Design an enzyme around this catalytic site. Sequence first.
Site, mmCIF file in Angstrom:
data_model
loop_
_atom_site.group_PDB
_atom_site.id
_atom_site.type_symbol
_atom_site.label_atom_id
_atom_site.label_comp_id
_atom_site.label_asym_id
_atom_site.label_seq_id
_atom_site.Cartn_x
_atom_site.Cartn_y
_atom_site.Cartn_z
ATOM 1 N N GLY A 1 0.500 47.904 61.115
ATOM 2 C CA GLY A 1 0.623 49.345 60.910
ATOM 3 C C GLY A 1 -0.639 50.187 60.939
ATOM 4 O O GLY A 1 -1.738 49.667 60.714
ATOM 5 N N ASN B 1 -1.180 47.667 51.348
ATOM 6 C CA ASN B 1 -0.061 46.725 51.276
ATOM 7 C C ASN B 1 -0.495 45.376 50.680
ATOM 8 O O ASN B 1 -1.485 44.809 51.126
ATOM 9 C CB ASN B 1 0.504 46.510 52.690
ATOM 10 C CG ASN B 1 1.885 45.917 52.768
ATOM 11 O OD1 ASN B 1 2.464 45.487 51.784
ATOM 12 N ND2 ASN B 1 2.435 45.847 53.953
ATOM 13 N N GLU C 1 -3.654 52.343 59.906
ATOM 14 C CA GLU C 1 -4.404 52.336 58.655
ATOM 15 C C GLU C 1 -5.733 53.086 58.677
ATOM 16 O O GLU C 1 -6.403 53.216 59.706
ATOM 17 C CB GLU C 1 -4.625 50.891 58.164
ATOM 18 C CG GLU C 1 -5.677 50.117 58.939
ATOM 19 C CD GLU C 1 -5.538 48.610 58.860
ATOM 20 O OE1 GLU C 1 -4.432 48.129 58.520
ATOM 21 O OE2 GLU C 1 -6.536 47.913 59.153
ATOM 22 N N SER D 1 0.817 51.334 57.524
ATOM 23 C CA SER D 1 0.635 50.213 56.619
ATOM 24 C C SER D 1 1.513 50.349 55.343
ATOM 25 O O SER D 1 1.403 51.328 54.616
ATOM 26 C CB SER D 1 -0.846 50.084 56.266
ATOM 27 O OG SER D 1 -1.207 48.762 55.897
ATOM 28 N N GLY D 2 2.458 49.437 55.174
ATOM 29 C CA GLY D 2 3.341 49.450 54.019
ATOM 30 C C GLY D 2 4.532 50.378 54.126
ATOM 31 O O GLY D 2 5.056 50.826 53.103
ATOM 32 N N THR E 1 7.814 44.909 58.550
ATOM 33 C CA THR E 1 8.007 43.465 58.394
ATOM 34 C C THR E 1 9.284 43.178 57.647
ATOM 35 O O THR E 1 10.053 42.310 58.061
ATOM 36 C CB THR E 1 6.794 42.840 57.712
ATOM 37 O OG1 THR E 1 5.662 42.976 58.568
ATOM 38 C CG2 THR E 1 6.997 41.395 57.369
ATOM 39 N N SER F 1 0.169 42.776 53.859
ATOM 40 C CA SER F 1 -0.098 43.458 55.117
ATOM 41 C C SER F 1 -0.115 42.463 56.256
ATOM 42 O O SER F 1 -0.752 41.428 56.120
ATOM 43 C CB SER F 1 -1.435 44.190 55.043
ATOM 44 O OG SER F 1 -1.587 45.145 56.082
ATOM 45 N N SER F 2 0.571 42.753 57.379
ATOM 46 C CA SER F 2 0.518 41.863 58.542
ATOM 47 C C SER F 2 -0.787 42.171 59.223
ATOM 48 O O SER F 2 -1.030 43.323 59.568
ATOM 49 C CB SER F 2 1.658 42.137 59.514
ATOM 50 O OG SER F 2 2.904 42.230 58.847
HETATM 51 N N1 ADP Z 1 13.774 47.705 52.749
HETATM 52 C C1 ADP Z 1 12.962 47.359 51.745
HETATM 53 N N2 ADP Z 1 13.514 46.985 50.569
HETATM 54 C C2 ADP Z 1 12.707 46.625 49.567
HETATM 55 N N3 ADP Z 1 11.373 46.577 49.541
HETATM 56 C C3 ADP Z 1 10.852 46.949 50.716
HETATM 57 C C4 ADP Z 1 11.556 47.344 51.843
HETATM 58 N N4 ADP Z 1 10.689 47.603 52.895
HETATM 59 C C5 ADP Z 1 9.505 47.365 52.387
HETATM 60 N N5 ADP Z 1 9.527 46.968 51.077
HETATM 61 C C6 ADP Z 1 8.372 46.682 50.230
HETATM 62 O O1 ADP Z 1 7.228 47.302 50.797
HETATM 63 C C7 ADP Z 1 6.230 46.305 51.117
HETATM 64 C C8 ADP Z 1 5.536 46.698 52.394
HETATM 65 O O2 ADP Z 1 6.519 46.560 53.435
HETATM 66 P P1 ADP Z 1 6.159 45.684 54.707
HETATM 67 O O3 ADP Z 1 7.432 45.293 55.346
HETATM 68 O O4 ADP Z 1 5.177 44.639 54.335
HETATM 69 O O5 ADP Z 1 5.436 46.817 55.572
HETATM 70 P P2 ADP Z 1 4.588 46.910 56.922
HETATM 71 O O6 ADP Z 1 5.015 45.667 57.676
HETATM 72 O O7 ADP Z 1 4.970 48.198 57.618
HETATM 73 O O8 ADP Z 1 3.130 46.875 56.520
HETATM 74 C C9 ADP Z 1 7.012 44.995 51.181
HETATM 75 O O9 ADP Z 1 6.201 43.839 50.989
HETATM 76 C C10 ADP Z 1 8.041 45.191 50.072
HETATM 77 O O10 ADP Z 1 7.427 44.969 48.807
HETATM 78 O O1 VO4 Z 2 0.885 46.713 56.311
HETATM 79 V V1 VO4 Z 2 1.268 46.391 57.812
HETATM 80 O O2 VO4 Z 2 2.051 47.589 58.405
HETATM 81 O O3 VO4 Z 2 -0.039 46.229 58.688
HETATM 82 O O4 VO4 Z 2 2.096 45.060 57.940
HETATM 83 MG MG MG Z 3 3.923 43.963 58.274
#
Ligand code: ADP
Ligand code: VO4
Ligand code: MG
Length: 706
Positions: free
Chosen positions: A407, A183, A409, A134-135, A139, A186-187
């Site tokens: 992700g 996050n 969690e 998560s985070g 995405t 969060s998706s």
């Molecule tokens: N490559 C990146 N550049 C800048 N900020 C990023 C990057 N990857 C992630 N982030 C930051 O981290 C947050 C969490 O990433 P996200 O893609 O939502 O993660 P996940 O999908 O794994 O939960 C994003 O909303 C953004 O604020």
């Molecule tokens: O925070 V996620 O990895 O569930 O998008």
């Molecule tokens: Mg996501």
Amino acid sequence: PFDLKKDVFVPDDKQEFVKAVTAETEYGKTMQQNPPKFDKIEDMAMLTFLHEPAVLYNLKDRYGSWMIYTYSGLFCVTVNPYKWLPVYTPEVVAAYRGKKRSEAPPHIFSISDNAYQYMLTDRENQSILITGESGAGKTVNTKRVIQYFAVIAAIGGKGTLEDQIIQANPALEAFGNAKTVRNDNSSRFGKFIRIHFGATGKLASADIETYLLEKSRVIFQLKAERDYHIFYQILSNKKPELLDMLLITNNPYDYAFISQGETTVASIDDAEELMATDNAFDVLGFTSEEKNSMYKLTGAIMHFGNMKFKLKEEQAEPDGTEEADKSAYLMGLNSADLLKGLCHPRVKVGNEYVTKGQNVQQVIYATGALAKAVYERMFNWMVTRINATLETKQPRQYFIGVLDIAGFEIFDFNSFEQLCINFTNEKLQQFFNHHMFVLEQEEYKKEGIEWTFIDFGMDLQACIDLIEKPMGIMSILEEECMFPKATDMTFKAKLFDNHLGKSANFQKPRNGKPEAHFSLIHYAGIVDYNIIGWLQKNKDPLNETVVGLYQKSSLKLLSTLFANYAGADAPIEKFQTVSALHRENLNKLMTNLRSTHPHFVRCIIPNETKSPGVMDNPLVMHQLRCNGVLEGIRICRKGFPNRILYGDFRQRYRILNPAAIIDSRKGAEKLLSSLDIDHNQYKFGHTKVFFKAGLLGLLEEMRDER
Ligand SMILES: Nc1ncnc2c1ncn2[C@@H]1O[C@H](COP(=O)(O)OP(=O)(O)O)[C@@H](O)[C@H]1O
Ligand code: VO4
Ligand SMILES: [Mg+2]
């Protein structure tokens, strides 16, 4: 300054490892370091020393100079910078086009371009699989893969296919993403996007498939989390006509279904996001009746929660018709029939009907349940509609799939939803393990290569078997539903009787924090699960009298969301549960990914406090360990990661020595000994030449000179 023998990495109880079996560290108190030439190396399989701190510090080094991508053998690792960087510009996108992996710095754009190259070169479907907790950045990277392809294609109301493809993510994000502890975006669902290409590489069309949405969020939140983004975007008032149409106030705290935890997020401007959400639905082809119907349903969900009930046997009766009326008009239903359905649901007596009774606890459940069902069906409808305009019916041949799952969690309170999310993460890790360590070595064997199978310890089959296989956690849960005398404690007792002491990944809850019933040794940690409400969550029953009214609704959207309803089968003279369909879908996805060339992108969350540039070595090491980054690097070094068909080897490298050439294999043997190379850096297979790590680059360097 570098001393080859005394410059070593030593363990540490707070920093995992430190720069320095007896010596004192660089700080004071009492594994070889790599030379200064391998500082910030683009591929870690090229480091002379390979160990946990060599990889940890190389990632840390690059992260300090804002280099968030690093190749680790045949795959890639990325560390969330938590801040914007000038590395995703259109200028950058164009420069990455047509470049081989080694001809540009590590990047998600390079993975996307190379996946495109392998697709047209080998005539084979590709997949880009983004892992991480998560985070970590799944995405964000999923959106950059799409951006790369859409920008490349664009070289040559509703916009072009390329614009629609990009806007599908912020359209779905408003309804499927929410602020959790880990996050702010969060998706709360998985998604697989396929980007279709014609026989010669033209981007032909695209599709999206979503996997299980966290329905519970719609009507329930934990202290440190918000409901779905959409609610707060509407309440932002940046579009005040929505508040009048939905008949609502501008205060989230006036709606219990959405105001149980947090209501505002520091990193999210809810007002600007409503405009981005609305603009996406516009670009995607959504009509005003379509957009308004979706907004109206979201509004009806909000009022639905504020509906109070009271006693009239315990029978429920409406405690004020104020909120039911507002919900009923947005939905296109008669308010009296809705409350009569909720309080007195019909029972079929052949061609007649008798009403059964409900108490305020039963009606409260059914009310929440219907608001979740509507939300789920609306999200599934949005996806179908996005797919409908994304279908171009232009000639297609291949596709590049992109996997952005929810992700891994661990919350203070873990329930059914967490087990589904974490289960997929275990499965995707096992996909990586099988591909990298099992299939890879079996290729060596198939090709008659001299090899001894190496055991990398990468195998989560025990935990996956515990969850999915018969008499597992899901199988026990599936049996316990459609047994009305089954309770939360009969399910708990059945889980313990079958798995306590019998399954190593099933342990007593570790447990201040909320009460847990069982523990699960997941690939990335022990998760304490709470089984309260699992039987009802898995059966997901609905008030069929209210569903009937939904099918007869005056709003086209609500009637279409429920048209094909699986109404409980007619009784005879004497069904698919949530987890059953989720496993079915996960296995469907895993088998589909087996028929593609996969491209692993591993995301690493650098710290718990969303702090840019801050790397917490114990958190980073935990991820690199459970991911198998070191194990995945070793199979690149210790094996043969590059292999060329004898035909292709003469078609390309015949220019190195035309004197060597009329057989495919025999000619390739003559060519290789004729060159100034280490003759142990390669082996001869049945149909391919197997190259040790780096030899491909050396021959390709010599090919470009002449
Ligand atoms: N490559 C990146 N550049 C800048 N900020 C990023 C990057 N990857 C992630 N982030 C930051 O981290 C947050 C969490 O990433 P996200 O893609 O939502 O993660 P996940 O999908 O794994 O939960 C994003 O909303 C953004 O604020
Ligand atoms: O925070 V996620 O990895 O569930 O998008
Ligand atoms: Mg996501």
